[PDB]
Amino acid sequence: SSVIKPVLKITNEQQNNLNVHPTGKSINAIRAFTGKGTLIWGARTLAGNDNEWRYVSVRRFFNMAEESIKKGSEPFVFEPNDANTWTKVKAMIENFLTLQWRAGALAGAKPEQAFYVKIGLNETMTALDILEGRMIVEIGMAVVRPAEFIILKFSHKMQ
Amino acid sequence: PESQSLSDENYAALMSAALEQCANLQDRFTVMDLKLPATRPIPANAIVGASNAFRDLSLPQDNLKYGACYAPDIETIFNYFYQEDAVTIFRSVNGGAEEQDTLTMAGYNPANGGDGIQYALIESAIDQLPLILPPSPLVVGQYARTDNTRGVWKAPANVALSSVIKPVLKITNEQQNNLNVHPTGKSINAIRAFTGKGTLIWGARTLAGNDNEWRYVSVRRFFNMAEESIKKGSEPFVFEPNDANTWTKVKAMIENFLTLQWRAGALAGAKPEQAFYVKIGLNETMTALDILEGRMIVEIGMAVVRPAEFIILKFSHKMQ
Amino acid sequence: STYKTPGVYIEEISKFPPSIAQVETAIPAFIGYTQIAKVGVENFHTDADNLILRPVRITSLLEYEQFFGKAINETTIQVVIQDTTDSRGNLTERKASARITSPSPHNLYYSMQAYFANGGGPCYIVSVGPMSNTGTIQLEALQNGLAEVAKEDEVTLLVFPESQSLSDENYAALMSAALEQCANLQDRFTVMDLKLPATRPIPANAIVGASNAFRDLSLPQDNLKYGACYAPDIETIFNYFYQEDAVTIFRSVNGGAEEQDTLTMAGYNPANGGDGIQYALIESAIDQLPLILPPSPLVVGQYARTDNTRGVWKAPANVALSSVIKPVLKITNEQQNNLNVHPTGKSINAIRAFTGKGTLIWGARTLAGNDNEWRYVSVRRFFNMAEESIKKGSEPFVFEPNDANTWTKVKAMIENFLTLQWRAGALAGAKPEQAFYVKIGLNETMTALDILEGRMIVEIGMAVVRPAEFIILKFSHKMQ
Amino acid sequence: IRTYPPVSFFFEVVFQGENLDKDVVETRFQSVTGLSVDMQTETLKEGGENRFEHILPVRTKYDPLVLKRGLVNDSQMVKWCMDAILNFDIRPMNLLVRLLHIERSSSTIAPLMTWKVINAWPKKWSVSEFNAEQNSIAVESLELNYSYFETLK
Amino acid sequence: AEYPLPKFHFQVDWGGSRLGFTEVSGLDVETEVIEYREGNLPQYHKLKMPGMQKFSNITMKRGTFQGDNDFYKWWNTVALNTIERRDLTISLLNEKHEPVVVWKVNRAWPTKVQSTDLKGDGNEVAIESIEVAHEGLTIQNG
Amino acid sequence: AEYPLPKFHFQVDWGGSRLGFTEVSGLDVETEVIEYREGNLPQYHKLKMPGMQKFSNITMKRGTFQGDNDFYKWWNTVALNTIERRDLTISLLNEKHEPVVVWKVNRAWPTKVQSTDLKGDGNEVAIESIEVAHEGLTIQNG
């Protein structure tokens, strides 16, 4: 909004070396399209060769989820380190991730296909750990990734 | 409440005397505040220099399990007391330098022939001052609330403060790393603001933070409560004949008290026999020498639990 | 790092999901080489000689990692990049694939991982020496470990995950010693794997030659009721450990011959100035390798699950395996005909895939397959369980006066135990009197000679049931 | 992104008129309805095109606005209406219709949605039946014509 | 084993000061049934197929102590259509005071609060009760 | 403490001459539930949201004494749609005869008055009862 024009014009042959490069240091481009205006083209991070963290949206989603889980878990600090608190924190985390699955952010037809949360003695924690004041929870989450290329093929149909 | 205006040597002397009589009476606990640089505005990282200055006070090493220290000072909502003719007025125009006027508030009061519009403006200005207090009386009030709501064997932490606007200093995680754990054991608890929650007490450790038994405030407060109540219960048996019957009576009293405490959830164990033990007897706890001269010796053991402080998480991707 | 401030800390760690279980009857012992083996302040491998040999009780993979480490690097991984190009050299498509030419023989870590994935419980670990890049496996170290495991009473199953790299004579010697101490202790059972030709790809009908080779091993004839053998090896989903600069790269263009490049993976890493696109391609290729394991640790995990769910008196067969992609060989009915029944009695059980079901264990017969009493695994496992529990129950009566009162006490204990077992459905019969009998008495079971010298003799009989294996059908047309 | 829809029973009506916007009893109603618009069209058939016909826009129509209250014995609004009806003297007004909610940032009552209704004047007035054998309230109902309505964006 | 469990040792986590209750009920999951038949079916009864789900409300009781007014506070948190919502967790324990069966309740909020009855000759305590609505429930055994 | 309270010691203030009653009931607060679902929700059960409130009537009993006709007088205060309205306060006391839980009732007025039954062999007293309507109620504990 409130934009007249980019100062430089970038073509496809130039963006070929801006989106994919041996170093992974991707650069996103602002380009004008006829009848549309000035658009943002490219959504890749500075780690463009990383099989997990190529795309901006995946990392932003992971950051949002992690901070909200952190806020939800904070009220349990200074509690007795026993099975009841483990149950309490596990239930909180599963409820949050279920609400997130319902919104369409996680992949899968059922909650059991989208995420898992685990905590327990000799499962995620050890005996000695209990004696010091530490809790260990293992969380896994399934996400989806966007498509970038569309290929069209033409031929002559027989009359 | 007035200790912060006292010099460092006198501060150390006062606190050492307080800790000494806490150790002598065996039923008291001391709450302290940290002295901050008396500058306005307070510079960056003043908390580090303040902590370093505190670490150097000469305090008795074996009494440090009888106290705790909190930081920093707090801005609250209460008003100051003042006399109208003692308030000084300054003026500034278009951002220039301030100039002291020849009138006080008494010269703007319309009862004396002043300008009442500016008088009302000045009064509204004065009412907006925040008041700055040390944290200790709020900590004591919160101790009372926590014992009423959860129980004395719980940590008095992760609780919000009332009638508080703001901490004067902002403490980060990298700074609290050297406040909670330190080679000297002189732990300092922090008052921190959390978004959407307000101002909370963070940390529940004593000045003996490296002691395998007396690290935590709640354990010592529980032991003090139990010991004073046992003392009160046992007092009626003084001046009784020193014989097996009185030993039996006092033993029964102590076991009944500890059973009531186990039932409330304060002691660990699935059965009373796993939570405590009480013993008295000839050539078991007493030699006849103590019996004849009028002494009784009882041995009591108790099992308690301790809190967890750090919660960790592992995030990963799941095969589709 | 080390936590100091009382808050919530978040870390991104990539690993598999944990899994634990509660098991009462299936307590196995695994013998092999390890990476660390350090407990407390004692390093068991501190000296090259004078190794400390002692079993350690483990309940989870985390506890295993705490004491023994994980694994070593493979050094034999190759990746081939296929390029499809134009007549002018213009690139049209690029793909990559990974292969391993000769895996290391040291595999306890992957075996423990597969064991816990399939429902295993507490186990004993005995190290016989450190893992090394030479891959040398010696008979003497394994026999010393087997000799040491004789001192722990809870052990029920014996496993040697590394036995397949051992020569045939040494393999026969090891297994003969294992069967001998199973027969001497009277409370253990041995699980074996079949040795397959070490060729890639494996030729047709290799299973027949492998079976013939197995039949010729010299094993003690009267101890063959104390073990069982399974085949073949299994492809699973776990990853290899490797060092980046040890991976070799090859290229091929338009289907031509492969050519070895001058770089390793370390030369494609963009941190060193390489091409990161091909680097990502290579890493994705390496992650897709399947891992090949012998079947025995999965069989032990499935024993634990079956005893927890059905009962020990049931056959541990017709059960699916977890975290398994595929058997390496396909076995048909005409081939299993000579694996299940054979003049020598040395039966071999098969792992087979069934459509819509997955990979199942098919066959529940021991190495004494012609014995009218001890053909089936479940019967012997049940007898072992009952005998050890009777032994434990009777032990408190040692050093008692040898008189009628002690005989009465021990008889009552045994009848009560067998009654509880009848009630659970393990023994046949409509009434306890039809299921078992227990007898003791002077000139009934004992002569006075045994009484005076301090012996007691009790005679016990038990009735069990046996499974059906073949189901037949007759199809016909009905008059309209 | 919304998860829960709004509620219909908390609402208000304001008369931007002679001096009725400050009279408390002139904002309290038991029911308000009639806020709907319709486009009227005609159908044209083209020869040779047998798959569909053409729908052509013609004009726009609006519904009357209906208000219901318990009977108020002395109302300035009713004086306005009866002056229009008995003496054929009409003076159109503007109206606001509000849908309300609770907002907090402690809490306060605030408008959620607002419609402007332009050039309203009386159409109909009625009172309910009197019946000796029923427990009921005297209810009066007013219906108004207007030109159009718009959203106060 | 061969022995079942009892129902006299449990715990409820609801966001209050006390975890003890006298009665817990309303744990149930239901699904609807749809029936269908075509004309030429050699079968004269209808076919069945799964439909939508339905959950019931939760009812809990407790004795009245001095200084405890949490039920009314939570109920009175209500605003026009908004209210504080909570995660409710109910557990079953064994003899070492550890959990065995867990019910997990998402987004609970109270719909009814019922106070006590007063009788002069009554030799019984004062019992208050609450009824809770909630979207979905889950069961974890083991 | 660890001990609950009983229900056999209370008091009612209603604007009469006697504060003693035999039975007190109808203390309850309720809220409505609204359900909603859109078409593409991965959830097949409906969502819930708070609605309007509802209060129940109050029923109180008492024995009949000579010279006391307050229930009928208050009921007979009625006119076409007008009546005297009162503030009703019900309290719970402890052992020092002080209050502990208070119910506050706004704008109460009676809707039903029921007299006694007469039986010749009856060895029971004469019991009258009243039913009260009221806009809203409140609860104060502590």
Side-chain angles (χ1 to χ4, degrees):
Chain A
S1 323
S2 322
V3 167
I4 297 168
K5 187 182 74 69
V7 300
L8 298 175
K9 186 176 179 180
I10 300 170
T11 66
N12 289 341
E13 273 306 309
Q14 295 173 319
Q15 191 165 6
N16 277 340
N17 289 291
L18 294 172
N19 194 32
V20 179
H21 192 274
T23 64
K25 294 173 178 172
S26 312
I27 300 167
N28 300 306
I30 311 301
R31 290 175 61 172
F33 293 86
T34 175
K36 298 178 181 179
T38 303
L39 311 181
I40 299 171
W41 213 249
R44 195 172 292 204
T45 67
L46 289 171
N49 291 321
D50 193 318
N51 283 332
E52 292 182 354
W53 303 113
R54 271 196 278 270
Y55 297 104
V56 172
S57 54
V58 174
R59 172 145 285 287
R60 288 183 70 226
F61 174 76
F62 268 88
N63 288 346
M64 183 276 292
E66 289 170 359
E67 68 190 350
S68 316
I69 291 293
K70 181 178 178 179
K71 284 182 177 178
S73 36
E74 285 179 353
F76 293 98
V77 178
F78 303 113
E79 292 289 305
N81 211 357
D82 72 357
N84 298 337
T85 310
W86 308 341
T87 320
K88 286 182 201 180
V89 301
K90 176 180 172 179
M92 181 276 294
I93 294 167
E94 293 177 350
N95 286 334
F96 175 82
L97 287 173
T98 300
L99 284 168
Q100 287 298 302
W101 169 78
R102 190 171 75 188
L106 299 176
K110 294 178 73 172
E112 294 85 345
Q113 300 175 311
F115 59 90
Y116 70 88
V117 182
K118 293 181 182 179
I119 167 167
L121 173 64
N122 292 323
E123 301 180 8
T124 71
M125 294 171 292
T126 189
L128 177 57
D129 279 358
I130 300 301
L131 299 178
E132 295 300 358
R134 317 193 263 246
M135 295 181 184
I136 304 168
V137 192
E138 298 181 20
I139 306 166
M141 298 169 67
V143 305
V144 302
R145 292 177 172 82
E148 299 186 45
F149 309 102
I150 303 171
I151 304 166
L152 309 175
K153 298 182 182 179
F154 293 85
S155 77
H156 286 249
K157 184 176 180 179
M158 193 224 100
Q159 186 178 345
Chain B
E2 297 168 358
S3 288
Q4 286 179 322
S5 64
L6 196 67
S7 84
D8 290 354
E9 303 83 13
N10 293 338
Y11 184 84
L14 176 61
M15 295 314 191
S16 295
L19 289 174
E20 286 179 351
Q21 90 168 16
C22 289
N24 286 337
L25 297 173
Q26 293 279 298
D27 57 353
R28 299 182 179 180
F29 192 82
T30 305
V31 186
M32 293 183 238
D33 303 313
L34 185 68
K35 292 177 64 172
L36 303 178
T39 309
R40 297 292 181 275
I42 319 185
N45 306 323
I47 195 68
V48 176
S51 149
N52 287 342
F54 184 82
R55 299 270 186 265
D56 289 328
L57 300 174
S58 95
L59 306 171
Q61 182 63 46
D62 50 89
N63 296 323
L64 292 172
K65 66 191 176 190
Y66 287 104
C69 179
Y70 295 85
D73 290 347
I74 292 168
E75 294 179 356
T76 76
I77 68 166
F78 298 109
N79 300 318
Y80 286 96
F81 282 70
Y82 66 95
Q83 184 179 309
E84 183 183 348
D85 64 292
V87 175
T88 303
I89 311 300
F90 296 82
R91 288 182 183 273
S92 178
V93 179
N94 288 322
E98 296 175 1
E99 299 177 355
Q100 186 171 321
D101 175 55
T102 59
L103 300 175
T104 64
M105 282 182 75
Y108 288 90
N109 194 316
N112 303 321
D115 185 3
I117 303 167
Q118 290 175 81
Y119 185 77
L121 182 61
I122 292 165
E123 259 189 320
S124 267
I126 291 172
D127 187 283
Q128 301 299 306
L129 276 166
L131 179 73
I132 298 172
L133 299 172
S136 50
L138 308 179
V139 172
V140 171
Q142 290 300 332
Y143 282 3
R145 290 185 68 248
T146 297
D147 315 322
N148 275 342
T149 298
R150 296 289 269 92
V152 75
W153 54 96
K154 202 225 176 265
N158 202 17
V159 289
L161 299 170
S162 323
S163 322
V164 167
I165 297 168
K166 187 182 74 69
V168 300
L169 298 175
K170 299 180 181 300
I171 300 170
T172 189
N173 289 341
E174 273 306 309
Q175 295 173 319
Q176 191 165 6
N177 277 339
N178 289 291
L179 294 172
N180 194 32
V181 179
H182 192 274
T184 64
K186 294 173 178 172
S187 312
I188 300 167
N189 300 306
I191 311 300
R192 290 175 61 172
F194 293 86
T195 175
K197 298 178 181 179
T199 303
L200 311 181
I201 299 171
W202 213 249
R205 195 172 292 204
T206 67
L207 289 171
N210 291 321
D211 193 318
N212 283 332
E213 292 182 354
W214 303 113
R215 271 196 279 270
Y216 297 104
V217 172
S218 54
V219 174
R220 172 145 285 286
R221 288 183 70 226
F222 174 76
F223 268 88
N224 288 346
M225 183 276 292
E227 289 170 359
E228 68 190 350
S229 316
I230 291 293
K231 181 178 178 179
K232 284 182 177 178
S234 36
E235 285 179 353
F237 293 98
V238 178
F239 303 113
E240 292 289 305
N242 195 335
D243 73 357
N245 298 337
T246 310
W247 308 341
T248 320
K249 292 173 187 177
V250 301
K251 176 180 172 179
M253 181 276 294
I254 294 167
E255 293 177 350
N256 287 334
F257 175 82
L258 287 173
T259 300
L260 284 168
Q261 287 298 302
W262 169 78
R263 190 171 75 188
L267 299 176
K271 293 178 73 172
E273 294 85 345
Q274 300 175 311
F276 59 90
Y277 70 88
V278 182
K279 293 181 181 179
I280 186 185
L282 173 64
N283 292 323
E284 301 180 8
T285 71
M286 298 171 288
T287 59
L289 201 167
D290 302 2
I291 285 168
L292 281 143
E293 199 162 8
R295 293 190 288 274
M296 295 181 184
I297 303 168
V298 192
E299 298 181 359
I300 306 166
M302 297 169 67
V304 305
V305 302
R306 292 177 172 82
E309 298 188 68
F310 328 94
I311 309 191
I312 328 177
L313 309 175
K314 311 218 179 180
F315 281 72
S316 181
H317 295 267
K318 181 178 181 179
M319 181 182 62
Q320 186 178 345
Chain C
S1 181
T2 300
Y3 325 95
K4 295 185 177 181
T5 307
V8 175
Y9 298 85
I10 303 182
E11 300 179 2
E12 301 179 0
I13 300 299
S14 60
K15 68 176 190 180
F16 293 88
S19 60
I20 63 173
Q22 300 287 306
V23 177
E24 208 73 11
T25 307
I27 311 302
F30 297 91
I31 297 168
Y33 293 87
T34 59
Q35 188 182 46
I36 294 175
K38 181 175 181 182
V39 177
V41 296
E42 329 189 29
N43 190 331
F44 298 161
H45 299 171
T46 177
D47 289 345
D49 289 345
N50 300 306
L51 296 178
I52 295 172
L53 305 175
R54 62 194 292 185
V56 178
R57 188 175 184 271
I58 293 298
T59 50
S60 39
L61 190 61
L62 187 61
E63 283 186 342
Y64 180 88
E65 293 171 352
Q66 185 179 347
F67 299 109
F68 298 110
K70 293 177 183 177
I72 63 173
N73 301 324
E74 281 293 347
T75 320
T76 39
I77 297 169
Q78 304 180 338
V79 174
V80 181
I81 299 170
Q82 304 175 7
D83 288 353
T84 301
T85 73
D86 271 2
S87 35
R88 303 286 292 172
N90 299 334
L91 183 70
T92 315
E93 195 173 13
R94 175 174 287 159
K95 293 188 180 184
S97 304
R99 68 191 185 210
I100 183 135
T101 75
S102 156
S104 163
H106 293 158
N107 62 356
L108 279 186
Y109 180 68
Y110 303 120
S111 289
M112 293 306 296
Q113 197 165 43
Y115 167 76
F116 285 112
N118 271 259
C123 43
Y124 287 86
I125 307 299
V126 184
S127 207
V128 302
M131 290 162 76
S132 176
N133 205 97
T134 72
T136 305
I137 293 172
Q138 294 181 308
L139 180 62
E140 291 77 4
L142 296 175
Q143 287 185 338
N144 290 340
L146 180 59
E148 290 301 306
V149 80
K151 293 186 281 193
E152 296 267 303
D153 289 345
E154 331 172 3
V155 171
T156 305
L157 305 166
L158 303 178
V159 183
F160 300 94
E162 298 168 358
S163 288
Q164 286 179 322
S165 64
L166 196 67
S167 84
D168 290 354
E169 303 83 13
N170 293 338
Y171 184 84
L174 176 61
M175 295 314 191
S176 295
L179 289 174
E180 286 180 351
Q181 90 168 16
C182 289
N184 286 337
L185 297 173
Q186 293 279 298
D187 57 353
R188 299 182 179 180
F189 192 82
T190 305
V191 186
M192 293 183 238
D193 303 313
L194 185 68
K195 292 177 64 172
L196 303 178
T199 309
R200 297 292 181 275
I202 319 185
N205 305 323
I207 195 68
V208 176
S211 149
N212 287 342
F214 184 82
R215 299 270 186 265
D216 289 327
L217 300 174
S218 95
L219 306 171
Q221 182 63 46
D222 50 89
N223 296 323
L224 292 172
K225 66 191 176 190
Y226 287 104
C229 179
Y230 295 85
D233 290 347
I234 292 168
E235 294 179 356
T236 76
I237 68 166
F238 298 109
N239 300 318
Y240 286 96
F241 282 70
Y242 66 95
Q243 184 179 309
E244 183 183 348
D245 64 293
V247 175
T248 303
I249 311 299
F250 296 82
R251 288 182 183 273
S252 178
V253 179
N254 288 322
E258 296 175 0
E259 299 177 355
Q260 186 171 321
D261 175 55
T262 59
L263 301 175
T264 64
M265 282 182 75
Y268 288 90
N269 194 316
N272 303 321
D275 185 3
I277 303 167
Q278 290 175 81
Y279 185 77
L281 182 61
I282 292 165
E283 259 189 320
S284 267
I286 291 172
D287 187 283
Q288 301 299 306
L289 276 166
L291 179 73
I292 298 172
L293 299 172
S296 50
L298 308 179
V299 172
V300 171
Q302 290 300 332
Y303 282 2
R305 290 185 68 248
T306 297
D307 315 322
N308 275 342
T309 298
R310 296 289 269 92
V312 75
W313 54 96
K314 202 225 176 265
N318 202 17
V319 289
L321 299 170
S322 323
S323 322
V324 167
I325 297 168
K326 187 182 74 69
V328 300
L329 298 175
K330 299 180 181 300
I331 300 170
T332 189
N333 289 341
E334 273 306 309
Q335 295 173 319
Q336 191 165 6
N337 277 339
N338 289 291
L339 294 172
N340 194 32
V341 179
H342 192 274
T344 64
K346 294 173 178 172
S347 312
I348 300 167
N349 300 306
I351 311 300
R352 290 175 61 172
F354 293 86
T355 175
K357 298 178 181 179
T359 303
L360 311 181
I361 299 171
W362 213 249
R365 195 172 292 204
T366 67
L367 289 171
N370 291 321
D371 193 318
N372 283 332
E373 292 182 354
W374 303 113
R375 271 196 278 270
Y376 297 104
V377 172
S378 54
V379 174
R380 172 145 285 287
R381 288 183 70 226
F382 174 76
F383 268 88
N384 288 346
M385 183 276 292
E387 289 170 359
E388 68 190 350
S389 316
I390 291 293
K391 181 178 178 179
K392 284 182 177 178
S394 36
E395 285 179 353
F397 293 98
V398 178
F399 303 113
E400 292 289 305
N402 195 335
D403 73 357
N405 298 337
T406 310
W407 308 341
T408 320
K409 292 173 187 177
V410 301
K411 176 180 172 179
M413 181 276 294
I414 294 167
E415 293 177 350
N416 286 334
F417 175 82
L418 287 173
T419 300
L420 284 168
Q421 287 298 302
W422 169 78
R423 190 171 75 188
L427 299 176
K431 294 178 73 172
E433 294 85 345
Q434 300 175 311
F436 59 90
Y437 70 88
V438 182
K439 293 181 181 179
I440 186 185
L442 173 64
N443 292 323
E444 301 180 8
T445 71
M446 298 171 288
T447 59
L449 201 167
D450 302 2
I451 285 168
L452 281 143
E453 199 162 8
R455 293 190 288 274
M456 295 181 184
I457 304 168
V458 192
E459 298 181 359
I460 306 166
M462 297 169 67
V464 305
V465 302
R466 292 177 172 82
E469 298 188 68
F470 328 94
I471 309 191
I472 328 177
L473 309 175
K474 311 218 179 180
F475 281 72
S476 181
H477 295 267
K478 181 178 181 179
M479 181 182 62
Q480 186 178 345
Chain D
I1 297 169
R2 180 169 64 83
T3 306
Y4 295 95
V7 166
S8 93
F9 54 74
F10 196 30
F11 63 93
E12 202 196 349
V13 176
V14 178
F15 289 82
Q16 296 184 304
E18 306 189 347
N19 192 31
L20 299 174
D21 50 307
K22 293 180 178 69
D23 196 347
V24 168
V25 282
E26 304 297 339
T27 43
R28 298 175 177 178
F29 289 88
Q30 189 178 35
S31 183
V32 181
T33 194
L35 202 65
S36 44
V37 60
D38 183 39
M39 183 66 75
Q40 297 181 359
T41 189
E42 53 166 80
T43 298
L44 176 70
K45 180 176 177 66
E46 181 176 0
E49 177 60 81
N50 298 316
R51 198 196 212 101
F52 58 91
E53 40 199 352
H54 298 290
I55 307 300
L56 315 190
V58 177
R59 61 179 179 179
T60 300
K61 184 176 176 182
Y62 288 83
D63 279 347
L65 188 68
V66 182
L67 303 168
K68 292 189 179 181
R69 297 192 299 200
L71 185 70
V72 178
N73 63 345
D74 175 284
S75 323
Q76 299 300 317
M77 175 217 292
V78 176
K79 287 184 172 72
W80 168 77
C81 305
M82 292 305 160
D83 210 277
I85 291 168
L86 285 171
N87 293 299
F88 221 87
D89 179 7
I90 322 179
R91 303 179 301 270
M93 295 196 291
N94 296 327
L95 317 177
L96 298 175
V97 178
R98 292 173 175 166
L99 187 67
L100 308 171
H101 74 124
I102 302 298
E103 219 166 49
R104 56 159 320 112
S105 158
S106 300
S107 298
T108 189
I109 299 166
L112 179 62
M113 282 284 289
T114 303
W115 295 268
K116 302 184 295 188
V117 183
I118 291 164
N119 291 328
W121 52 279
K123 177 184 178 180
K124 183 177 179 182
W125 183 91
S126 295
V127 72
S128 64
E129 177 183 352
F130 300 160
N131 192 317
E133 298 185 1
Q134 298 182 335
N135 288 315
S136 318
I137 300 169
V139 176
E140 64 173 311
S141 90
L142 178 68
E143 302 190 7
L144 303 171
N145 292 307
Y146 61 91
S147 286
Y148 64 96
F149 66 87
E150 230 197 300
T151 309
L152 185 65
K153 264 153 22 162
Chain E
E2 40 180 0
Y3 299 90
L5 299 176
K7 61 179 181 179
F8 67 82
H9 202 31
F10 55 90
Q11 183 178 301
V12 178
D13 295 329
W14 61 290
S17 280
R18 186 148 40 103
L19 307 179
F21 283 81
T22 61
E23 289 181 0
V24 165
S25 289
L27 298 178
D28 59 358
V29 296
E30 42 179 1
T31 318
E32 296 284 5
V33 180
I34 300 168
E35 294 176 341
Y36 184 79
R37 180 175 176 272
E38 267 140 5
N40 61 340
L41 188 72
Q43 260 185 178
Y44 311 114
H45 35 271
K46 303 178 182 180
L47 308 194
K48 302 177 181 60
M49 182 179 60
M52 298 176 79
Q53 278 79 45
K54 286 180 59 179
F55 301 88
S56 178
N57 300 1
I58 303 181
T59 302
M60 293 177 182
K61 292 183 177 59
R62 196 182 57 179
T64 301
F65 282 59
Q66 186 173 355
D68 209 42
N69 202 1
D70 304 328
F71 284 169
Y72 185 72
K73 287 188 294 190
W74 189 17
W75 184 91
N76 198 46
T77 303
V78 68
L80 177 63
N81 56 356
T82 84
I83 191 167
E84 180 191 2
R85 294 180 171 88
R86 298 182 185 177
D87 287 336
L88 175 66
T89 299
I90 301 165
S91 61
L92 180 57
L93 297 68
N94 54 0
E95 97 278 3
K96 272 230 188 168
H97 318 306
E98 300 180 357
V100 174
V101 197
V102 180
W103 295 265
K104 301 175 182 178
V105 181
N106 192 31
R107 300 177 67 76
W109 59 271
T111 61
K112 220 158 143 207
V113 180
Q114 291 185 60
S115 295
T116 189
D117 295 1
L118 303 178
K119 304 177 182 178
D121 189 15
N123 186 340
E124 302 178 359
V125 300
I127 300 298
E128 56 181 318
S129 163
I130 61 171
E131 181 172 350
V132 175
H134 64 94
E135 298 182 359
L137 188 147
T138 299
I139 305 173
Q140 176 179 344
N141 190 339
Chain F
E2 40 180 0
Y3 299 90
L5 299 176
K7 61 179 181 179
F8 67 82
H9 202 31
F10 55 90
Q11 183 178 301
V12 178
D13 295 329
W14 61 290
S17 280
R18 186 148 40 103
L19 307 179
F21 283 81
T22 61
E23 289 181 0
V24 165
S25 289
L27 298 178
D28 59 358
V29 296
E30 42 179 1
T31 318
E32 296 284 5
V33 180
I34 300 168
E35 294 176 341
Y36 184 79
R37 180 175 176 272
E38 267 139 5
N40 61 340
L41 188 72
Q43 260 185 178
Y44 311 114
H45 35 271
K46 303 178 182 180
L47 308 194
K48 302 177 181 60
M49 182 179 60
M52 298 176 79
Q53 278 79 44
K54 286 180 59 179
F55 301 88
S56 178
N57 300 1
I58 303 181
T59 302
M60 293 177 182
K61 292 183 177 59
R62 196 182 57 179
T64 301
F65 282 59
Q66 186 173 355
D68 209 42
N69 202 1
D70 304 328
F71 284 169
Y72 185 72
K73 287 188 294 190
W74 189 17
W75 184 90
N76 198 46
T77 303
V78 68
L80 177 63
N81 56 356
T82 85
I83 191 167
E84 180 191 2
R85 294 180 171 88
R86 298 182 185 177
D87 287 336
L88 175 66
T89 299
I90 301 165
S91 61
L92 180 58
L93 297 68
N94 54 0
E95 97 278 3
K96 272 230 188 168
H97 318 306
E98 300 180 357
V100 174
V101 197
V102 180
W103 295 265
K104 301 175 182 178
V105 181
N106 192 31
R107 300 177 67 76
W109 59 271
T111 61
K112 220 158 143 207
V113 180
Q114 291 185 60
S115 295
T116 189
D117 295 1
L118 303 178
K119 304 177 182 178
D121 189 15
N123 186 340
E124 302 178 359
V125 300
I127 300 298
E128 56 182 318
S129 163
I130 61 171
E131 181 172 350
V132 175
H134 64 94
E135 298 182 359
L137 188 147
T138 299
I139 305 173
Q140 176 179 344
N141 190 339

